[PDB]
Symmetry: D2
Amino acid sequence: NLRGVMAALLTPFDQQQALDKASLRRLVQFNIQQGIDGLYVGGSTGEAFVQSLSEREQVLEIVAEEGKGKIKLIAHVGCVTTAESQQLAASAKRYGFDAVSAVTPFYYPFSFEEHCDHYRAIIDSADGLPMVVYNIPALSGVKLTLDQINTLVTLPGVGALKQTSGDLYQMEQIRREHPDLVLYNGYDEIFASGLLAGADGGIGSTYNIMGWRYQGIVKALKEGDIQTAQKLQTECNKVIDLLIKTGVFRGLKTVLHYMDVVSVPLCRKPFGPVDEKYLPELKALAQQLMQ
Amino acid sequence: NLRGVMAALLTPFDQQQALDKASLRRLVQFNIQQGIDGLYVGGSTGEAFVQSLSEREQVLEIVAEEGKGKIKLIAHVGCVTTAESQQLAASAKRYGFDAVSAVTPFYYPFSFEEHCDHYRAIIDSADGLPMVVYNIPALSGVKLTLDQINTLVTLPGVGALKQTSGDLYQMEQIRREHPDLVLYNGYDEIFASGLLAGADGGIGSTYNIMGWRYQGIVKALKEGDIQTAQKLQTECNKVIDLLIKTGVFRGLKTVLHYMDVVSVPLCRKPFGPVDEKYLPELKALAQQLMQE
Amino acid sequence: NLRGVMAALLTPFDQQQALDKASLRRLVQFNIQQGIDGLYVGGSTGEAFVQSLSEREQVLEIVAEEGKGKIKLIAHVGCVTTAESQQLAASAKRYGFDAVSAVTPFYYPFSFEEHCDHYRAIIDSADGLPMVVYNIPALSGVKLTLDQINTLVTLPGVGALKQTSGDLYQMEQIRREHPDLVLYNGYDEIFASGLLAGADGGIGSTYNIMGWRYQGIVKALKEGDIQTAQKLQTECNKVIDLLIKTGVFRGLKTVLHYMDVVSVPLCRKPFGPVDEKYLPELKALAQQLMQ
Amino acid sequence: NLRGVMAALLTPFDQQQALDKASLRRLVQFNIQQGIDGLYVGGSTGEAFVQSLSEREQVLEIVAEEGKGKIKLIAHVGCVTTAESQQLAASAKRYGFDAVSAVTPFYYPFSFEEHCDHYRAIIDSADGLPMVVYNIPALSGVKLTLDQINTLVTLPGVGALKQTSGDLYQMEQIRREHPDLVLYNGYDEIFASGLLAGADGGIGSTYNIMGWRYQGIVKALKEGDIQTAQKLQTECNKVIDLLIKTGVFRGLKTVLHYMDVVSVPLCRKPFGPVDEKYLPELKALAQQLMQE
């Protein structure tokens, strides 16, 4: 029951670069009203790795108050530290999330057994909550094999895989091996093809501003209308082309700001602000997205 | 016109590792008979890089004798040398090939300007036959950006792109930018996803043994049947899974040998033969494909 | 002045994985008696990325107390967050460290301008403490170009460069570009060769158990005895071969345990233990080194 | 006896991209007069992959003549094809080269066993000429491991390893593993550092224009004169900085042309000519090296 299209939620900050709880709530609700299946909180999109545990715990608690019960809630608990992740797993359980998730610990090179044991501990602290292994080689630097992916995916307590890899041959091998697994397409740029390959849903950050399109693609493919599915995917990619230019997290926040959801569309440094030149296309996209 | 499902033809050798003209002829006809749209001859799959210009021309001449007029024939003409490719480009024209193609020159790191001049020179020697740019970063080690690809793909004389890359985001950006470009999906394993992304056909090695499945996936997607489309792709993927264990060229030749097409299923040295342990699966594969 | 052989400090944890101050202080002094030029604390080798800010500061203060004045002190102060880094920089200043240091912010891809501004923000917070730029592409996933490294190394405040790259062509290019730059060779396996190419020192994790060898090579190259230098470098590589085999941080902590310096040779999870099969090897290693 | 500093010979071509035999010989003698220990011919530097077997045989044959056991002669015989490599190996013996060499076969991914069988066959064809395994990850795209290098290096017939890798930890480990192995440093930019790590000599393209500098680093380190060892290395690097800017092969041919050694400073396409803007630097460089 975790299958679906879930927005990878952004965390709005104020001018002092501190959570803008008023905008977070405004964002949780915005996402809900756009027909998303659930929320993935505290992930890469949420600038989790540029945050503290207490900060991430705080974001966790606020979205649960805002959305527990309404949609499916998945907490990204991943830290490079196991002990740190368990803490977050523990709070996630306590706040009432539906599932837990974690990136493959990065920076320090870890053997695969260390990767399995890391997931085990987090699964343990999660206290019953199904785990969503989070695979993103491009940012984590962790290049898992198919067998390793199969081993992790079959670990007790693991209930899903978040595949942020544009390797669609592996996406289907995974599906062929595990017909019942909940597989989320991590790269928005290839959503439609990802589903055709074996994905039964997705978790992506561009959903925040246009989740209905992704859900639209789900219906189109479900009704054998690949013609509109494709149309939706290019529309989604025209956006992604732009966001990749302006910077994705900050560009999404600028759009959301023009949508009157986010007060201050800032990301935390190292990130800088959007180049002013991009502001008009973003303003424009916000207005146009209001469809 | 050049759109469609083209099989990247293998080249059959004998015990002496010399060309097996008879098996080659059998292979062309087998592909034709299996309803393929055309043939991509002398590419990686044809073991071009382990044979000489003459050996390469000889193959172009033979398949032209056999296939010309009955299906599209694209001659893979590239070498590291512009001079060698120009010579091959000239022969493909002489033999009556429909288009010409060439990988981005490898081993030596060439600039992008040098890559463009290589293509212009070859196109020039193609004297009319359209050029299909062959992009396979995984083998050539030439990592082109989307801009470079757009420039190449728009070079006067270029009719198509053979995208051998699994980046289906790029596959659609290329399409978004060249709505009329003939786009070939290079990786069979993602054929259905690559078409949904923007590819309008494909060129590949496994098409030699189960090409009808690819034609099938094409029609299904056309008639909005994603069920058989996906069904078709997974059945292609289990074959590809095996061939990837056994060796694709040698594995495909071995199945062909069992379908009574190829006399000796050996590739050229340094390729070693298929591991005996894999034969039970290969024969069995040849059987089911023969049955379907 | 900041030139020299500087050991990258390991942080000794207890059975409960909490800082082992007894062993820390013991390791500080152990390193001092080894005749090391100073200590690089809170870096990759100190498990910085699996500790919290406070934990990192605590460690910072204890070594400052233990070695301030006795030897040169450089505080690795970097995180992915510029703000976290600044805070630790501000603390390094307070505790009286000699210089500040920071890896290029990893995980999220940051623009070169972003990286430059990040070092700038930390430099500001270092309140007069020179910045030692930390180049470790293998782990950070950040591959700067020469011109980029050149810009970085010349930022107002940057005093040296820790080059953790085996590119000894770029090493001589850096020394050629900057004849007065404090250039630290970051990979112990090529120390001797790093110095012949331009580094005027080095910061290594293995220096903790055999720092004298590294000072040995230095003297030999200075006296023109490359024969002994080479002999010293092959000796260090036999050790390094093993550590990579057993796991470097964990292996080192184990040798230091048999050297009665560290109580429990544990690294924090996700890291795992040393396989028992290596203890006689590591045991014999501690015996020969102390011999 | 294969240990030493040996120049990776360039192959001069005329205005029409054909071999310039006169300049080849002129280039051989020049290198000889430069006190180089021997020559490596037909390698990457010699633009082999842009030549035909017979073209490579021609080059081999002309330098063997010129080379008349005046210096050590090593023939890079490798191609992707084992059979092509064998023929070349068999010609090299026929010409009287002192050893044979070969890169790890590229483009198509091969297994370690396929690589081991490859070398053996070639070794087999060399008929007594030892094999200098040629390792260049950057170009071949083949990532051998130390244990793989060890296996190859101990393979009967293998007498040397040409280490074109910047990994000086691995260079140290190979020397450690093989105290008596002829280990040639492949990257001139780190010659001094590679020797300190265990390389006992080198094979390089820039040796063509300043082989005496590398002979000087060798002597300097021998006499423990690290001070001059470093000046020689930075002087070599200042040069390489430029060559990388212009194109190494072409920059070299350009300096050699200015030294009236090479008639036409061209590389076969797809290599383009040197940017006119760099001539002032190459003109001056040819001057100081000459003046030197």
